[PDB]
A paper describes a structure:
Influenza virus genome encapsidation is essential for the formation of a helical viral ribonucleoprotein (vRNP) complex composed of nucleoproteins (NP), the trimeric polymerase, and the viral genome. Within each vRNP, the viral RNA (vRNA) segment is encapsidated by the viral nucleoprotein (NP) and attached to the heterotrimeric RNA-dependent RNA polymerase. In this study, we established a biological tool, the RNP-like particles assembled from recombinant influenza A virus NP and synthetic RNA, and we present the first subnanometric cryo–electron microscopy structure of the helical NP-RNA complex (8.7 to 5.3 Å). The RNP-like particles are a tool that mimics the influenza nucleocapsid.
Therefore, we performed a local refinement focused on three successive NP protomers along the same strand (called later in the text NP−1, NP, and NP+1, respectively) (boxed region, and C). The small RNA molecule is located at the interface between two NP protomers. Of note, the RNA density local resolution varies between 4.5 and 6.8 Å, suggesting that the RNA is globally dynamic within the RNP-like structure; therefore, we only modeled the phospho-ribose chain, and we did not assess the direction (5′ to 3′) of the RNA structure. Here, we observe that residues R150, R152, R156, R355, and R361 most likely interact with the RNA phosphate backbone and that Y148 and F458 may interact with the RNA bases, while residues Q149, K273, and R391 are in the close vicinity of the RNA and could also be involved in its binding. Observation of our structure indicates that an RNA molecule of at least 10 nt is required to bridge the NPs together at the NP-NP interface and thus to form the RNP helical architecture. With this modeling, about 22 to 24 nt can be fitted per NP protomer (12 nt buried at the NP-NP interface and about 10 to 12 nt across the central basic groove), agreeing with the previous studies establishing the RNA (24 nt) for one NP stoichiometry using mass spectrometry and biochemistry coupled with EM. The overall structures are similar, except for the oligomerization loop (residues 402 to 428), which displays considerable flexibility and various orientations, as well as a loop spanning residues D72 to K90, which also revealed several conformations and notably an α helix in our structure. In addition, upon RNA binding, the flexible D72-K90 loop folds into an α helix, increasing the accessibility of the central basic groove.
Numbering used by the authors:
A (entry chain C), B (entry chain A), C (entry chain B): 21 to 490
The structure:
RNA sequence: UCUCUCUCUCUC
RNA sequence: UCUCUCUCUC
């Protein structure tokens, strides 16, 4: 059933919106100041710093960074008669802990935490990607496309684990491998056992993320190494560059600004009654009647800022620019010529130059965002019946495909990673930049609610550039 | 997290400083005597000898060099009413081993030991470059800029592996290749196993140090030779010659003399609380308020000696003279016209001519020392995405940059080294000596603590000479 | 490390000394008979006839030369109450081989074979220059200074190949290419395959011994010729004419008379304990208290013979007469006015004519025979830093000397040998006969052991002639 | 080398 | 070939 999930997510976002309402009440902010992204951003880093129970425990025993008992940051932006001023107001964690506890009807609301931290990961991926760490581990900077959910720490649950990219897991596992290579950390002690456990948890997350059997089997065999040394490093680099084309089925969770939920809840649009969804039309129509104000530099233009905000909201920074333009209806400028900077404001920037203005989030069309892969993999390896089920009692042979059943069970088990790298190479050669994917699905219009009739897009606009970076 | 590494480095430097305080207590030296470079050098080389297990174990089975059961060296210099005296005082290994034992709260302090070996590597690289071994191996002494950490023994760990450079690894590999050519050391004995293990580990370190893909793949094809003969000899020479321009980001650890650390520790500046960094402003901020004395010959210029010792402390002997002078604030004299000699003093030179004086270490500016390479390599090979991820479920093509996809995989595996020499010489031809590097970075002022605003240098002083040697 | 090398050196020279002692044992010779250079010469020639496995294997299948089953030569001289007698005593190979086996504790002592062959090469080069070979090859007899180690056979190892001079290598290359011109030996048979491996190895030695890179390139381009004809003949000729001034650092190994080692070992001076070297003070310190007797014709000058024996022992046949006179302390007579003959005695000369007399070997000073070249080549082509190592991350250009790095790679590969001949000619024009050498090295006094202080010689005796030949 | 291998972010 | 052309080095 899907009604229960819809009711749960509706209750969750209703609690989130009511917490936004109460923060607006408590902060004594104006109507316009309650529609600013910066305030929600700072408040949500406060949120994560209050539920980072692991870091709370680590910092209680580590009283450093000067005045840091329980309070961090808090750069609240306020308006005086047109001009803007930032105040470093410090809030302790504990009162906000109870205000959450009262905001979710006595519950902890950790799922909402996962969605906000994922949405921060989405905005981080949209704004800046780290080739710095990517080459710190030595991996080439060609794979910036697989840094989805990179900023997400381990503390998130399964829902958070679903949206993290393959490359994020590759980076996280290489960090552990390099740490275990630097020092003899895999001893029979509890630390070794726990890092072992986290390792297989991250690995079965990985093998769940993939779709084709060959990469799942080679991930299975990578596990067989009890002592991760140097060979596994290139083994999993080969895994990553294979996932470049044999991409993993990674979800795209549609989270929206802290305010958008608050404005919707304040108007009385209860999500429990009519139901809510995270993949369907819902986050699209809530943005159809949402007003958002933002802060812009004297050199920054708002036109690219609105598009970057739409990137951050819908996590489409790693998608084709042409498709995003089609749903937008306007051309989406790649990051090469974006005359803008990061959304977050540096702590040293002056305030006389800063100017606030609206953001455009209206889109002409809407589309479903499933956690599936391109149809090209199914074209390379088709599907269908593998055996037959006897129905009538008639003397006959029972057909069964031996060369497929034996290959599924791998009667002669693979010896190392290179033998499967051979099929990786032949699949890559079979792959083409022409194979059309997502057959049977299309882009839909706003006026339709039940997914009745789509329109098939068709682009012949040469080589405008389907690459957000470079 | 960076707090844990900061605490660890602060702890081990505090241990080193309080060991130096213990040495100053036990040696019964005056206040000026503990501000001498020479006595710190003597005690520090003594520590190197005491903690070097391999040479020791080679020595108790080899009772040679006359008086050598367990005591070596020890030329302690003492000021006698203005004059100086040198005494050859001999110390046991176990006593000072245990003095370290409580000098670090029961730990081995391997990281501190690596710090001392690295600081020795910097002093040797600043004073004398080993053209002699280069010509011995037939290797051109034009490339002394590849001799980072040549005096380092192989006992240094991963932290020590970070600092030892590409050309030094070429030299040590050439040594082992010459040894294996002289005699058949490649048999199936345990010696052959340890040789191949060391050889593959050192090749892994090499492939870690390089940046461009072509050199990495050529090195990966280097160790395919199970029986290294003569071809890999010129292969490695050409590796060094190509790494001349495509340099590897090895390391430039800013190690400081034990006297400076001891003076800071004695004053009560505990490093654990406020933190320590070896790469940022921190190793710099101790030096503008540091007093250092040293002995000088009646012909040596103290002004040159201060510049040379600041070079050795900051390991800037292979850095360009223009920027080194800009950061220092005064012109730096190249090795050609230095009216000074090595900071180490000969054991046979007379006692009368030595004169002590203060060493100038204060510098006008500061800069961060990143372990990276010039931007010119990224100019030759640009940056950007290679793959895309489907965010919306739309029936569309998945753009893949196929010709670079083969390039990463090398579908047609390289036949030999020569095909790689071809395009690497092509890249060398594409290189220009006017390529500005390190974009987006600059030199900051001492009043800056958080790296808020740098100033970009601009050198138009003709051809003063960006070559410390020659 | 050098301790193991000195220990091994002491080991095999101690074995050789004990072998000579036991020769004195079962030869039933007197004390004076054990101090005769020619007895050592004859015994050691019988030894080489015993240890020439290739020559033996060529010999048993060819039973010629009358009484030659296993016994060759053996002209032993004995004193009969003042007079002299010569007897042709024949010994087998196997018992001598077994005595060597028992003399080096069951080892083959191939290093001793190499050293004895090197001593023979120095003796023959000092005595007679085979200008007949030069005229047969057509190479002019003014190049006899490049005849170092001509008598050496191919069977010598890497140490034996080290002393072999450039001219001798050119000679066997001319011989082999002439043989390849006479008949079609370059066919696909195994003989041609061993031919090409030998030719390539000799070319590797050729590129090894020189110092300047342009000749490396020229000799490498000589080697690529799959069919060496008359052009490569001329190429090697020009290589010799270039190597006259661009001398290769071949070797100057100082091997000495077996009688001297036997006398030293018999006295109880163990070389393994105190260490021994073939380049340092050791060969100098043993000869100051060594007595050697030799046979002299009724016309031969004993004063000339002592000097010739000392020069042959120290391998100064191609050195400077003036420097030899300085190191010896007395004037060295050139070959033009030597009133002596070859050390070895002809088999037909009568026994009544020659008389025994002492040989003077003591020298006033001692020096070091380094395996390097004159400083003039480094004056023509200097040394220094060519590339810059970025230490501090600063927005700057990273200089690299393009006109030198490109010249190192030779981006436009050399067309033929003539283009390199052109730069050889211009370097010859830049060459001068007044280029001083030993800038920092000098001749030392005997009383010093640890290489403390030199005296720089100054020769102003006009034009006595620094030419041992002519 | 998590005190910055490039597109810049106080955010660990 | 560790006792060392090269700018010093126990």
């Amino acid at each position: 059933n899907a009604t229960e999930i819809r009711a749960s997510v509706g209750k969750m976002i209703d609690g989130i919106g009511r917490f936004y309402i109460q923060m607006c009440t408590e902060l004594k902010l104006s109507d316009y100041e309650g529609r600013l992204i910066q305030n929600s951003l700072t408040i949500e880093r406060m949120v994560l710093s209050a539920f980072d129970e692991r870091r709370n425990k680590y910092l209680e025993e580590h009283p450093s960074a000067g005045k840091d008992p329980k309070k961090t940051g808090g750069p609240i932006y306020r308006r005086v008669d047109g001009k803007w001023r930032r105040e470093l107001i410090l809030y302790d964690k504990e009162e906000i802990r109870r205000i959450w506890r009262q905001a979710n009807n006595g519950d902890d609301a950790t799922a909402g935490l996962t969605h906000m931290m994922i949405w921060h990961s989405n905005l981080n991926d949209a704004t800046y990607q780290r080739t710095r760490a990517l080459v710190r581990t030595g991996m080439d900077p060609r794979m910036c496309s697989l840094m989805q959910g990179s900023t997400l720490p381990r503390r998130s649950g399964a829902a958070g684990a679903a949206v993290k990219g393959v490359g994020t897991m590759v980076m996280e596992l290489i960090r552990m491998i390099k740490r275990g290579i630097n020092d003899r950390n895999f001893w029979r002690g509890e630390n070794g056992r726990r890092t072992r456990i986290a390792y297989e948890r991250m690995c079965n997350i990985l093998k769940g993320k993939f779709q084709t059997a060959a990469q799942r089997t080679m991930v299975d065999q990578v596990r067989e190494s009890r002592n991760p040394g140097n060979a596994e490093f290139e083994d999993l680099i080969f895994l990553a560059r294979s996932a470049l084309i044999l991409r993993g089925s990674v979800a795209h969770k549609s989270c929206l600004p802290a305010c958008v939920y608050g404005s919707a809840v304040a108007s009385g649009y209860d999500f429990e009654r009519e139901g809510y969804s995270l993949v369907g039309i819902d986050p699209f129509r809530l943005l159809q009647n949402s007003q958002v104000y933002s802060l812009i530099r004297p050199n920054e233009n708002p036109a690219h800022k609105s598009q970057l905000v739409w990137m951050a909201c819908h996590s489409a920074a790693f998608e084709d620019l042409r498709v995003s333009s089609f749903i937008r209806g306007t051309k989406v400028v790649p990051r090469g010529k974006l005359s803008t900077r990061g959304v977050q404001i540096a702590s040293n920037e002056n305030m006389e130059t800063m100017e606030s203005s609206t953001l455009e989030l209206r889109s002409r069309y809407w589309a479903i965002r499933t956690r599936s892969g391109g149809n090209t993999n199914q074209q390379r390896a088709s599907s269908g019946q593998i055996s037959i089920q006897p129905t009538f009692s008639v003397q006959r042979n029972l057909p069964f495909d031996r060369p497929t059943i034996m290959a599924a069970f791998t009667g002669n088990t693979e010896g190392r990673t290179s033998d499967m790298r051979t099929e990786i190479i032949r699949l890559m050669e079979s792959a083409r930049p022409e194979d059309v994917s997502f057959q049977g699905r299309g882009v839909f219009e706003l006026s339709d609610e039940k997914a009745t009739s789509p329109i098939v897009p068709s682009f012949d606009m040469s080589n405008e550039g389907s690459y957000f970076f470079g």
